[PDB]
């Protein structure tokens, strides 16, 4: 019953992950959240600000 189930496995290591779960139908989706630059930082401050 994986209808709508979702697991976000926060990984602070890109190049060390189990070889079995990186297959299709599994943990094969990857999101590199980058550090913000000037624009992004500024917007964060403005959001907190208001």
């Amino acid at each position: 019953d994986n209808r709508g189930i979702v697991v976000l496995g926060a990984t602070n290591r890109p190049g060390a992950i189990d070889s079995a779960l990186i297959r299709p139908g599994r943990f094969d989706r990857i999101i590199y959240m980058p550090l913000p630059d000037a624009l992004g930082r500024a917007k964060i401050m403005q959001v907190h600000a208001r």
Partner: protein, 215 residues
């Protein structure tokens, strides 16, 4: 026993037995250039090559999608590119790799010990900003370190920093890592292997033999 060479060729052919492969992708060179890898990583590499070809809007032609699939799991993730603001980082992290590839080609001339350059990236993909990949020669060429091979390796180490210096007209910190590698290689050249002329025949009275990884 991890598969290698012929076993890696068999694994790559098994995972590419239902997908069209362009003739420009050297399967033997790809198998020799990916040592120690198993089927549980080559399947992912072929998978990501197929998905990159699908996202590229064409069939699996050219070697760039295969190289991107290899890079996605050897140098994981893709960092944002170098900024176009200011001409410093695009010049430094192109000059070092251009100089390394140029020195590799020049040492492939005359001597021939230095292997050919596969690619230079300069797009940051994980823990690094630029790369130079070397077309790993066959084994039994790596089972023995020669004096000329070590000299060529020292030159290839110094090449990136001296190329950055030649491009900028200025010394940078890019020579620090190259100096750190080349000094260790030169100490192995002089002391342990005894390739130098120290004492008139190269045999020093002291050498630092490396220890095992079990410590």
């Amino acid at each position: 026993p991890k598969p290698d060479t012929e076993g890696r060729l068999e694994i790559l052919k098994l995972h590419l037995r239902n997908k069209q492969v362009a003739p420009d992708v050297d399967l033997l060179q790809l198998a020799r250039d990916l040592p120690g890898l198993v089927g549980a990583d080559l399947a992912n590499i072929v998978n990501e090559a197929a998905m990159t070809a699908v996202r590229s809007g064409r069939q699996q032609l050219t070697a760039r999608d295969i190289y991107a699939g290899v890079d996605r799991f050897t140098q994981g993730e893709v960092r944002p590119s170098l900024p176009t603001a200011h001409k410093l980082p695009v010049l430094c992290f192109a000059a070092k790799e251009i100089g390394i590839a140029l020195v590799a080609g020049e040492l492939r001339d005359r001597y021939g010990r230095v292997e050919l350059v596969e690619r230079v990236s300069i797009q940051p993909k994980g823990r690094a900003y630029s790369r130079t990949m070397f077309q790993r020669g066959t084994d039994e060429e790596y089972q023995l370190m020669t004096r000329g091979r070590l000299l060529d390796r020292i030159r290839l180490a110094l090449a990136g920093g001296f190329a950055v210096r030649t491009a900028l007209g200025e010394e940078t910190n890019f020579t620090a890592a190259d100096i750190k590698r080349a000094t260790r290689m030169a100490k192995k050249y002089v002391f342990y292997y005894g390739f130098s002329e120290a004492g008139g025949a190269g045999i020093t009275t002291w050498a630092n033999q490396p220890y095992s990884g079990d410590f």
